[PDB]
């Protein structure tokens, strides 16, 4: 329909319209009954208790999307070209993008071939030149993503402070990324947002943590997401090694936002800071949350 568009951008950069306006122009359409596509799979944990089982937590799981496409053309040679291009648009080692566009915007999911595709009918595919390919793809990162919101603050002063407006309009917590120039001692916020995961939700309401004093040329990226080491220096220096066992602990919880303060000291040149707030969602489309 015109209310929903589905696209694939392969590992080679090819563009495919599986559903929506302009679907099938490249020869491949999407068949019904696609699974683990909308809601991010989550399993809940329970521990024995006096009244049965008590809530113990939640864990998000990777997506196992099994969907069928239909590759078609009038003549078998061109159908074979279309099928070869569709196969080339996929890989096991590298992921390809799957974009869903609605009135809520465009959100993408990075998927890779979980196993070998299952192509064609029982007879040879050149009879019909119109054959289904069953694809079992997987999403290691199960959340749907929008392009992250980025802000930049530059200062020529030796000591300065700024405030970044930040707000999670999605339904899942997001982990902030910082890019800080060097030299300079930075103090970054790690606000709890009332998150009681460490039983410190109210104690860490205004938590701030100081990065180690950066030497010249040691511009750092500070990624709070757990898939990645927190501190990484551009010149390869071991900044987190210098940083004495500290860490950024809290994500930006859904529905929370504030003007988080960033402090810069001991920066003779004057430095720059960049804040990247990811936009993760659990469904391809959803009305904004408040």
């Amino acid at each position: 329909t015109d209310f929903l568009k589905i696209e694939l951008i392969g590992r080679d950069g090819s563009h495919w319209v599986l559903s929506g306006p302009g679907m099938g122009q490249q020869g491949v359409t999407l068949n019904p009954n696609l699974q683990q596509f909308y809601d991010a799979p989550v399993k809940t944990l329970y521990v024995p208790g006096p009244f049965g089982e008590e809530y113990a937590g939640k864990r998000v799981q990777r997506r196992e999307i099994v969907f069928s496409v239909q590759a078609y053309d009038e003549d078998p040679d061109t159908w074979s070209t279309v099928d070869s291009l569709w196969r080339w648009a996929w890989d096991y080692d590298e992921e390809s993008e799957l974009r869903v566009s609605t009135s809520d915007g465009t959100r993408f999911l990075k998927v890779r071939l979980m196993e070998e595709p299952k192509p064609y009918y029982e007879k040879d595919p050149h009879i019909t030149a119109d054959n289904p390919i069953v694809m079992t793809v997987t999403a290691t990162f199960p959340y749907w993503q929008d392009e992250p919101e980025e802000l930049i603050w530059t200062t020529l002063s030796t000591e300065d402070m700024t405030r970044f407006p930040v707000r999670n309009d999605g339904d899942v917590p997001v982990w902030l990324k910082w890019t800080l120039t060097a030299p300079g001692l930075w103090i970054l916020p790690d606000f709890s947002w009332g998150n009681d995961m460490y039983s410190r939700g109210r104690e860490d309401l205004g938590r701030t943590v100081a990065m180690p004093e950066l030497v010249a040329g040691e511009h750092v990226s500070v990624d709070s997401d757990p898939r990645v080491q927190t501190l990484i220096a551009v010149n390869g220096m071991p900044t987190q090694n210098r940083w004495k066992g500290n860490d950024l602990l809290y994500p930006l919880m859904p529905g929370k936002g504030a003007e988080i303060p960033v402090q810069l000291k001991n920066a003779p040149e004057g430095g720059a800071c960049k804040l990247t707030r990811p936009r993760w969602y659990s469904r391809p489309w959803s009305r904004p949350g408040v």
């Binding site: 302009g22 122009q25 020869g27 053309d73 003549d75 040679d77 061109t78 070209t81």
Partner: protein, 104 residues
């Protein structure tokens, strides 16, 4: 689809065989002065071959000696353009050129 596009197609090349596109496969209405050309390309954008078709009143004919199409490999891209008089060229058939021949 507000704007129409080309049609995806295939061409056949064979060693020692004349490359021919019959006019009944490109039937149409072409006023006098209508030109038509066909361009082959590799994956980098370089031209592997440029040919001009014989545009008659109601058909376009392509005919090339095997020497001309010898160097175009299997899997190259092709575009076919028809330029009506006093109008910009438009792409009719784009696609790929397969080589249907005994492989060595």
């Amino acid at each position: 689809m507000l704007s129409t596009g080309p049609i995806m197609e295939t061409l056949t090349l064979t060693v020692g065989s004349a490359f021919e596109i019959p006019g009944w496969k490109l039937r149409g209405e072409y006023p006098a002065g209508t030109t038509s050309h066909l361009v082959f390309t590799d994956a980098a954008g370089g031209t592997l071959g440029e040919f001009e078709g014989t545009v008659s009143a109601k058909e376009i004919h392509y005919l090339q000696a095997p020497d001309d199409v010898k160097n175009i490999p299997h899997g190259a891209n092709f575009q076919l353009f028809v330029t009506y008089p006093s109008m910009q060229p438009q792409c009719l058939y784009f696609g790929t050129a397969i080589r249907k021949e005994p492989r060595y």
